[PDB]
Amino acid sequence: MKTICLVGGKLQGFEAAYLSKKAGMKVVLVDKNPQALIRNYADEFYCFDVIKEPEKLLELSKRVDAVLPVNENLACIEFLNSIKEKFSCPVLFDFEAYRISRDKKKSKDYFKSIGVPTPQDRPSKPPYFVKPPCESSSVGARIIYGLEPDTLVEEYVEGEVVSLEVVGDGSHFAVVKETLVHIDETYDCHMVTPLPANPLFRQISHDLAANLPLKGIMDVEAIFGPKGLRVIEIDARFPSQTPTVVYYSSGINLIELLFRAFTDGVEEIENKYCIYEHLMFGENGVLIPVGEQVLSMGSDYGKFYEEPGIEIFLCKGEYPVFTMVFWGKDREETGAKRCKGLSVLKERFGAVL
Ligand SMILES: Nc1ncnc2c1ncn2[C@@H]1O[C@H](COP(=O)(O)OP(=O)(O)OP(=O)(O)O)[C@@H](O)[C@H]1O
Ligand SMILES: Nc1ncnc2c1ncn2[C@@H]1O[C@H](COP(=O)(O)OP(=O)(O)O)[C@@H](O)[C@H]1O
Ligand SMILES: N[C@@H](CCCC[NH3+])C(=O)O
Ligand SMILES: [Mg+2]
Ligand SMILES: [Mg+2]
Ligand SMILES: [Mg+2]
């Protein structure tokens, strides 16, 4: 049995912990917040700030098999970069790739440098899409029909939002599984489903990884627009939501793949269906689709229910959020599991949908 140390116990942390458990690993969580979202889901929880008490993390590195940063606190990431050589185990992160991916303008410069299409900057005709340069989870992202000077202003690209994940070992780049990102009125993601292979998007994603070169994990997001694919962002950190869909649809565990990248290496390149979604239990049990910004306000996140083809997680707080995971051989069977999962909530917990 191997042990993974996660630095960060929110949404990235949950995803990493979930897949680590599927891989039969023990999960040690480090988080500065006593109310860290996944504190009770991890096998061990150590509450400290790694910047304030680095010696505690370095000591932990002697008794775990890897340390995975799963947060987007630049102060934390920059600090970890400064002490990474002192770790007694691998740090599963690409600091150079993250420096590029965290800044959307820097990323767009990178896309342009290797000839990858990306939305036009500063269009003359509405609608415009605006977003901050360095956020995530669609925070500050909005359509426009006194902005900060570094706000991105782009042409609004209509179409499907699609994600691919890539794990590189510095030499080989494993492009994994296409996923569809289902968006709500805030442009946040409330649902993820798998998609068939897209050779063009796979090649683009490979090239984005290869030109760094990536030793770590990165995802690529694109909009399949009316005039073709436009890459909107990359994020060189462990993603939330999509890795669960990747796991059930393709059989690939991204935590295992990332660990392999830093130990033995990776090789390039199941066809099953999966539905992953978030539903808030509103007033009187009204079920409402919500995105990650709502889950991020939660107080306690862990497993609620499981049967064959169904996993349900509950994010407690001011109105709970259920994260539902359904899988099966095809869309029909998966839809039937979704129906069963919802019926459990309906009959036993008074939900309405
Ligand atoms: N230096 C650190 N040491 C320990 N844990 C940290 C550190 N920096 C961030 N974290 C934890 O990582 C988790 C994810 O942080 P991140 O900044 O990515 O998301 P966030 O939603 O902005 O978090 P926050 O609750 O701070 O607003 C949080 O639970 C946070 O407490
Ligand atoms: N140029 C654009 N046109 C249309 N929609 C966009 C555009 N850029 C971003 N979006 C939408 O906003 C969401 C968040 O933008 P993204 O660049 O992926 O930032 P992130 O860091 O916040 O998640 C996307 O998933 C997509 O739905
Ligand atoms: N870093 C934040 C946001 C991650 C959003 C990724 N889609 C968290 O771990 O909760
Ligand atoms: Mg992003
Ligand atoms: Mg995004
Ligand atoms: Mg993303």
Side-chain angles (χ1 to χ4, degrees):
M1 185 191 286
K2 290 179 177 62
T3 303
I4 192 163
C5 176
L6 307 178
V7 182
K10 282 188 95 163
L11 302 182
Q12 294 177 258
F14 176 73
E15 200 76 20
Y18 171 84
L19 286 177
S20 295
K21 288 186 185 200
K22 290 283 184 276
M25 305 184 86
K26 186 182 190 176
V27 179
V28 172
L29 170 67
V30 173
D31 199 297
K32 61 183 181 185
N33 186 4
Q35 276 289 118
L37 194 60
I38 66 152
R39 69 193 178 279
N40 294 314
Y41 185 68
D43 297 302
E44 292 183 3
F45 175 50
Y46 299 100
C47 185
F48 66 96
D49 189 314
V50 303
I51 307 170
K52 295 182 195 179
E53 299 185 281
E55 69 287 343
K56 281 184 167 60
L57 181 60
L58 294 177
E59 282 303 312
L60 276 174
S61 81
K62 295 181 177 287
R63 62 83 121 207
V64 302
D65 294 285
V67 169
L68 172 58
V70 267
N71 72 81
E72 296 172 293
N73 173 8
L74 184 61
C76 182
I77 301 302
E78 167 64 30
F79 180 75
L80 291 175
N81 204 6
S82 81
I83 58 155
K84 65 179 182 314
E85 298 77 17
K86 299 179 186 295
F87 280 76
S88 292
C89 65
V91 177
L92 310 178
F93 204 76
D94 190 322
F95 293 90
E96 163 143 321
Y98 187 72
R99 187 192 27 72
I100 297 166
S101 72
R102 71 168 294 276
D103 181 330
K104 287 180 171 61
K105 292 194 174 183
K106 197 164 179 71
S107 290
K108 286 186 79 172
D109 285 335
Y110 177 56
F111 305 156
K112 291 173 190 184
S113 80
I114 63 160
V116 167
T118 191
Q120 181 188 294
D121 294 291
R122 301 165 82 186
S124 294
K125 194 254 183 78
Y128 313 98
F129 201 83
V130 305
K131 55 196 179 184
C134 301
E135 280 292 290
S136 63
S137 312
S138 307
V139 172
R142 56 205 188 268
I143 191 166
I144 287 178
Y145 291 96
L147 266 34
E148 305 107 295
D150 263 317
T151 303
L152 278 84
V153 181
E154 289 181 321
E155 57 169 346
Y156 187 73
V157 186
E158 297 174 56
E160 313 329 301
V161 182
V162 179
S163 183
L164 261 174
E165 325 71 32
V166 187
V167 174
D169 65 13
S171 298
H172 316 92
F173 315 94
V175 181
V176 191
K177 177 73 179 176
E178 295 86 346
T179 55
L180 181 62
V181 179
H182 302 245
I183 296 308
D184 68 14
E185 70 281 353
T186 70
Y187 293 90
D188 203 342
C189 175
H190 78 94
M191 177 179 279
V192 180
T193 52
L195 287 170
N198 190 282
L200 173 63
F201 195 30
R202 297 183 77 84
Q203 189 52 228
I204 286 169
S205 294
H206 180 273
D207 292 343
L208 285 165
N211 281 106
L212 299 166
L214 176 73
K215 185 181 183 183
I217 188 164
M218 131 184 294
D219 73 355
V220 184
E221 286 168 356
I223 300 173
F224 284 43
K227 298 177 188 194
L229 184 158
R230 303 293 181 265
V231 176
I232 55 169
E233 76 153 348
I234 49 165
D235 279 315
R237 36 74 155 154
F238 201 88
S240 59
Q241 306 178 125
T242 56
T244 295
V245 173
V246 171
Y247 179 71
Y248 284 116
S249 69
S250 78
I252 296 159
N253 185 317
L254 288 170
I255 284 287
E256 289 188 300
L257 196 59
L258 177 60
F259 186 81
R260 285 191 200 106
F262 282 78
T263 52
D264 297 323
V266 134
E267 301 170 69
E268 310 219 328
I269 75 173
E270 295 263 71
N271 198 6
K272 179 143 130 278
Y273 204 77
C274 178
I275 301 165
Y276 173 104
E277 72 178 306
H278 311 295
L279 290 166
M280 172 171 258
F281 190 92
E283 300 207 3
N284 306 131
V286 65
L287 291 179
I288 312 161
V290 294
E292 294 200 300
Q293 288 173 51
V294 178
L295 214 59
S296 73
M297 291 187 289
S299 64
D300 197 10
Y301 198 19
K303 182 103 95 187
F304 180 82
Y305 183 77
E306 186 184 346
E307 72 177 64
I310 301 169
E311 286 178 293
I312 303 168
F313 297 88
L314 174 59
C315 181
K316 299 182 181 185
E318 186 206 297
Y319 289 111
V321 179
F322 292 102
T323 298
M324 346 230 75
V325 187
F326 310 111
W327 66 99
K329 57 171 184 180
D330 54 29
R331 290 186 72 200
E332 192 279 329
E333 189 182 33
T334 309
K337 293 298 170 191
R338 181 169 183 274
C339 283
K340 179 58 149 60
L342 289 172
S343 77
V344 172
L345 264 43
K346 176 185 78 181
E347 190 185 293
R348 177 155 261 278
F349 298 97
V352 34
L353 198 65

PDB file of all heavy atoms in Angstrom, residues 14-34:
ATOM      1  N   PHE A  14     -10.386  16.911  -3.119  1.00  0.00           N
ATOM      2  CA  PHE A  14     -11.386  15.848  -3.167  1.00  0.00           C
ATOM      3  C   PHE A  14     -11.146  14.888  -4.328  1.00  0.00           C
ATOM      4  O   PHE A  14     -11.164  13.669  -4.149  1.00  0.00           O
ATOM      5  CB  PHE A  14     -12.816  16.391  -3.250  1.00  0.00           C
ATOM      6  CG  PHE A  14     -13.842  15.305  -3.396  1.00  0.00           C
ATOM      7  CD1 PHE A  14     -14.162  14.492  -2.315  1.00  0.00           C
ATOM      8  CD2 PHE A  14     -14.447  15.059  -4.622  1.00  0.00           C
ATOM      9  CE1 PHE A  14     -15.083  13.466  -2.448  1.00  0.00           C
ATOM     10  CE2 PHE A  14     -15.372  14.035  -4.761  1.00  0.00           C
ATOM     11  CZ  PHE A  14     -15.690  13.240  -3.672  1.00  0.00           C
ATOM     12  N   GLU A  15     -10.928  15.447  -5.517  1.00  0.00           N
ATOM     13  CA  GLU A  15     -10.716  14.638  -6.714  1.00  0.00           C
ATOM     14  C   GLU A  15      -9.501  13.730  -6.566  1.00  0.00           C
ATOM     15  O   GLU A  15      -9.569  12.541  -6.880  1.00  0.00           O
ATOM     16  CB  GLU A  15     -10.552  15.530  -7.946  1.00  0.00           C
ATOM     17  CG  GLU A  15     -10.815  14.808  -9.258  1.00  0.00           C
ATOM     18  CD  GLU A  15     -12.294  14.598  -9.522  1.00  0.00           C
ATOM     19  OE1 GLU A  15     -13.121  15.316  -8.926  1.00  0.00           O
ATOM     20  OE2 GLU A  15     -12.631  13.726 -10.339  1.00  0.00           O
ATOM     21  N   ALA A  16      -8.395  14.301  -6.089  1.00  0.00           N
ATOM     22  CA  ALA A  16      -7.174  13.539  -5.859  1.00  0.00           C
ATOM     23  C   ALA A  16      -7.381  12.455  -4.796  1.00  0.00           C
ATOM     24  O   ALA A  16      -6.913  11.330  -4.960  1.00  0.00           O
ATOM     25  CB  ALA A  16      -6.037  14.468  -5.466  1.00  0.00           C
ATOM     26  N   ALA A  17      -8.085  12.794  -3.716  1.00  0.00           N
ATOM     27  CA  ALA A  17      -8.346  11.837  -2.637  1.00  0.00           C
ATOM     28  C   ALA A  17      -9.226  10.687  -3.130  1.00  0.00           C
ATOM     29  O   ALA A  17      -8.965   9.521  -2.833  1.00  0.00           O
ATOM     30  CB  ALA A  17      -8.988  12.535  -1.446  1.00  0.00           C
ATOM     31  N   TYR A  18     -10.263  11.035  -3.885  1.00  0.00           N
ATOM     32  CA  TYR A  18     -11.188  10.065  -4.468  1.00  0.00           C
ATOM     33  C   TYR A  18     -10.464   9.034  -5.339  1.00  0.00           C
ATOM     34  O   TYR A  18     -10.631   7.824  -5.150  1.00  0.00           O
ATOM     35  CB  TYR A  18     -12.271  10.804  -5.261  1.00  0.00           C
ATOM     36  CG  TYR A  18     -13.177   9.928  -6.091  1.00  0.00           C
ATOM     37  CD1 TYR A  18     -14.285   9.305  -5.522  1.00  0.00           C
ATOM     38  CD2 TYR A  18     -12.938   9.740  -7.451  1.00  0.00           C
ATOM     39  CE1 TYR A  18     -15.128   8.508  -6.283  1.00  0.00           C
ATOM     40  CE2 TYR A  18     -13.771   8.944  -8.221  1.00  0.00           C
ATOM     41  CZ  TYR A  18     -14.864   8.336  -7.633  1.00  0.00           C
ATOM     42  OH  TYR A  18     -15.685   7.550  -8.403  1.00  0.00           O
ATOM     43  N   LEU A  19      -9.646   9.514  -6.273  1.00  0.00           N
ATOM     44  CA  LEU A  19      -8.918   8.622  -7.174  1.00  0.00           C
ATOM     45  C   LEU A  19      -7.793   7.856  -6.477  1.00  0.00           C
ATOM     46  O   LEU A  19      -7.489   6.722  -6.852  1.00  0.00           O
ATOM     47  CB  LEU A  19      -8.393   9.376  -8.400  1.00  0.00           C
ATOM     48  CG  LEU A  19      -9.444   9.762  -9.443  1.00  0.00           C
ATOM     49  CD1 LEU A  19      -8.780  10.568 -10.544  1.00  0.00           C
ATOM     50  CD2 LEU A  19     -10.150   8.539 -10.018  1.00  0.00           C
ATOM     51  N   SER A  20      -7.184   8.467  -5.462  1.00  0.00           N
ATOM     52  CA  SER A  20      -6.173   7.781  -4.657  1.00  0.00           C
ATOM     53  C   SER A  20      -6.777   6.583  -3.930  1.00  0.00           C
ATOM     54  O   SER A  20      -6.164   5.518  -3.869  1.00  0.00           O
ATOM     55  CB  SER A  20      -5.531   8.735  -3.649  1.00  0.00           C
ATOM     56  OG  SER A  20      -4.797   9.752  -4.307  1.00  0.00           O
ATOM     57  N   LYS A  21      -7.980   6.765  -3.386  1.00  0.00           N
ATOM     58  CA  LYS A  21      -8.694   5.675  -2.714  1.00  0.00           C
ATOM     59  C   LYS A  21      -9.057   4.551  -3.682  1.00  0.00           C
ATOM     60  O   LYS A  21      -8.974   3.374  -3.327  1.00  0.00           O
ATOM     61  CB  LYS A  21      -9.954   6.193  -2.019  1.00  0.00           C
ATOM     62  CG  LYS A  21      -9.682   7.014  -0.772  1.00  0.00           C
ATOM     63  CD  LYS A  21     -10.985   7.365  -0.080  1.00  0.00           C
ATOM     64  CE  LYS A  21     -10.752   8.285   1.103  1.00  0.00           C
ATOM     65  NZ  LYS A  21     -11.908   8.239   2.040  1.00  0.00           N
ATOM     66  N   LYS A  22      -9.450   4.918  -4.902  1.00  0.00           N
ATOM     67  CA  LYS A  22      -9.750   3.938  -5.948  1.00  0.00           C
ATOM     68  C   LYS A  22      -8.508   3.112  -6.301  1.00  0.00           C
ATOM     69  O   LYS A  22      -8.610   1.932  -6.639  1.00  0.00           O
ATOM     70  CB  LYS A  22     -10.309   4.625  -7.205  1.00  0.00           C
ATOM     71  CG  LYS A  22     -11.712   5.204  -7.057  1.00  0.00           C
ATOM     72  CD  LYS A  22     -12.785   4.125  -7.105  1.00  0.00           C
ATOM     73  CE  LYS A  22     -14.181   4.726  -7.058  1.00  0.00           C
ATOM     74  NZ  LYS A  22     -14.644   5.006  -5.670  1.00  0.00           N
ATOM     75  N   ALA A  23      -7.342   3.748  -6.207  1.00  0.00           N
ATOM     76  CA  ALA A  23      -6.053   3.099  -6.446  1.00  0.00           C
ATOM     77  C   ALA A  23      -5.536   2.329  -5.226  1.00  0.00           C
ATOM     78  O   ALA A  23      -4.445   1.755  -5.268  1.00  0.00           O
ATOM     79  CB  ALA A  23      -5.030   4.132  -6.888  1.00  0.00           C
ATOM     80  N   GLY A  24      -6.314   2.334  -4.146  1.00  0.00           N
ATOM     81  CA  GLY A  24      -5.958   1.629  -2.916  1.00  0.00           C
ATOM     82  C   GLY A  24      -4.874   2.310  -2.102  1.00  0.00           C
ATOM     83  O   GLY A  24      -4.159   1.649  -1.343  1.00  0.00           O
ATOM     84  N   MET A  25      -4.751   3.627  -2.257  1.00  0.00           N
ATOM     85  CA  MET A  25      -3.753   4.409  -1.525  1.00  0.00           C
ATOM     86  C   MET A  25      -4.350   5.021  -0.261  1.00  0.00           C
ATOM     87  O   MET A  25      -5.540   5.342  -0.221  1.00  0.00           O
ATOM     88  CB  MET A  25      -3.195   5.546  -2.393  1.00  0.00           C
ATOM     89  CG  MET A  25      -2.608   5.146  -3.738  1.00  0.00           C
ATOM     90  SD  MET A  25      -1.889   6.576  -4.588  1.00  0.00           S
ATOM     91  CE  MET A  25      -0.256   6.583  -3.870  1.00  0.00           C
ATOM     92  N   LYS A  26      -3.514   5.180   0.762  1.00  0.00           N
ATOM     93  CA  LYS A  26      -3.869   5.963   1.941  1.00  0.00           C
ATOM     94  C   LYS A  26      -3.721   7.445   1.600  1.00  0.00           C
ATOM     95  O   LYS A  26      -2.778   7.838   0.905  1.00  0.00           O
ATOM     96  CB  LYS A  26      -2.965   5.593   3.119  1.00  0.00           C
ATOM     97  CG  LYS A  26      -3.345   6.256   4.434  1.00  0.00           C
ATOM     98  CD  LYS A  26      -2.372   5.882   5.538  1.00  0.00           C
ATOM     99  CE  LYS A  26      -2.884   6.347   6.887  1.00  0.00           C
ATOM    100  NZ  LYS A  26      -1.984   5.904   7.982  1.00  0.00           N
ATOM    101  N   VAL A  27      -4.652   8.260   2.088  1.00  0.00           N
ATOM    102  CA  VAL A  27      -4.652   9.691   1.803  1.00  0.00           C
ATOM    103  C   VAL A  27      -4.376  10.503   3.063  1.00  0.00           C
ATOM    104  O   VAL A  27      -5.174  10.506   4.004  1.00  0.00           O
ATOM    105  CB  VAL A  27      -5.991  10.149   1.179  1.00  0.00           C
ATOM    106  CG1 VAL A  27      -5.982  11.651   0.922  1.00  0.00           C
ATOM    107  CG2 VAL A  27      -6.276   9.395  -0.115  1.00  0.00           C
ATOM    108  N   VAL A  28      -3.240  11.194   3.062  1.00  0.00           N
ATOM    109  CA  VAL A  28      -2.887  12.129   4.123  1.00  0.00           C
ATOM    110  C   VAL A  28      -3.150  13.544   3.614  1.00  0.00           C
ATOM    111  O   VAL A  28      -2.628  13.940   2.572  1.00  0.00           O
ATOM    112  CB  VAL A  28      -1.407  11.971   4.546  1.00  0.00           C
ATOM    113  CG1 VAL A  28      -0.989  13.071   5.513  1.00  0.00           C
ATOM    114  CG2 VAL A  28      -1.166  10.599   5.162  1.00  0.00           C
ATOM    115  N   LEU A  29      -3.974  14.297   4.337  1.00  0.00           N
ATOM    116  CA  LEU A  29      -4.288  15.667   3.949  1.00  0.00           C
ATOM    117  C   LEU A  29      -3.589  16.682   4.835  1.00  0.00           C
ATOM    118  O   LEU A  29      -3.616  16.570   6.063  1.00  0.00           O
ATOM    119  CB  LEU A  29      -5.802  15.907   3.983  1.00  0.00           C
ATOM    120  CG  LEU A  29      -6.282  17.354   3.822  1.00  0.00           C
ATOM    121  CD1 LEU A  29      -5.974  17.877   2.425  1.00  0.00           C
ATOM    122  CD2 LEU A  29      -7.769  17.465   4.120  1.00  0.00           C
ATOM    123  N   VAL A  30      -2.973  17.672   4.193  1.00  0.00           N
ATOM    124  CA  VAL A  30      -2.472  18.861   4.868  1.00  0.00           C
ATOM    125  C   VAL A  30      -3.275  20.071   4.389  1.00  0.00           C
ATOM    126  O   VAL A  30      -3.388  20.313   3.186  1.00  0.00           O
ATOM    127  CB  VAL A  30      -0.972  19.095   4.582  1.00  0.00           C
ATOM    128  CG1 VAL A  30      -0.515  20.429   5.161  1.00  0.00           C
ATOM    129  CG2 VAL A  30      -0.136  17.954   5.143  1.00  0.00           C
ATOM    130  N   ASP A  31      -3.840  20.817   5.331  1.00  0.00           N
ATOM    131  CA  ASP A  31      -4.577  22.037   5.010  1.00  0.00           C
ATOM    132  C   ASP A  31      -4.524  22.980   6.205  1.00  0.00           C
ATOM    133  O   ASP A  31      -4.611  22.537   7.350  1.00  0.00           O
ATOM    134  CB  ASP A  31      -6.030  21.713   4.641  1.00  0.00           C
ATOM    135  CG  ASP A  31      -6.706  22.829   3.866  1.00  0.00           C
ATOM    136  OD1 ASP A  31      -6.868  23.942   4.409  1.00  0.00           O
ATOM    137  OD2 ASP A  31      -7.098  22.585   2.708  1.00  0.00           O
ATOM    138  N   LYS A  32      -4.387  24.274   5.930  1.00  0.00           N
ATOM    139  CA  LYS A  32      -4.296  25.304   6.968  1.00  0.00           C
ATOM    140  C   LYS A  32      -5.648  25.618   7.629  1.00  0.00           C
ATOM    141  O   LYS A  32      -5.698  26.284   8.666  1.00  0.00           O
ATOM    142  CB  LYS A  32      -3.688  26.583   6.378  1.00  0.00           C
ATOM    143  CG  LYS A  32      -4.513  27.177   5.241  1.00  0.00           C
ATOM    144  CD  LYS A  32      -3.868  28.403   4.620  1.00  0.00           C
ATOM    145  CE  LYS A  32      -4.756  28.958   3.516  1.00  0.00           C
ATOM    146  NZ  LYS A  32      -4.128  30.096   2.793  1.00  0.00           N
ATOM    147  N   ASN A  33      -6.735  25.145   7.022  1.00  0.00           N
ATOM    148  CA  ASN A  33      -8.090  25.412   7.513  1.00  0.00           C
ATOM    149  C   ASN A  33      -8.601  24.245   8.360  1.00  0.00           C
ATOM    150  O   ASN A  33      -8.744  23.136   7.844  1.00  0.00           O
ATOM    151  CB  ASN A  33      -9.030  25.661   6.319  1.00  0.00           C
ATOM    152  CG  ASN A  33     -10.437  26.087   6.736  1.00  0.00           C
ATOM    153  OD1 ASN A  33     -10.736  26.278   7.918  1.00  0.00           O
ATOM    154  ND2 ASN A  33     -11.314  26.238   5.749  1.00  0.00           N
ATOM    155  N   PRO A  34      -8.890  24.486   9.660  1.00  0.00           N
ATOM    156  CA  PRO A  34      -9.484  23.432  10.497  1.00  0.00           C
ATOM    157  C   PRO A  34     -10.814  22.929   9.944  1.00  0.00           C
ATOM    158  O   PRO A  34     -11.199  21.795  10.224  1.00  0.00           O
ATOM    159  CB  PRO A  34      -9.703  24.120  11.849  1.00  0.00           C
ATOM    160  CG  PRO A  34      -8.781  25.285  11.848  1.00  0.00           C
ATOM    161  CD  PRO A  34      -8.672  25.731  10.418  1.00  0.00           C
TER     162      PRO A  34
END
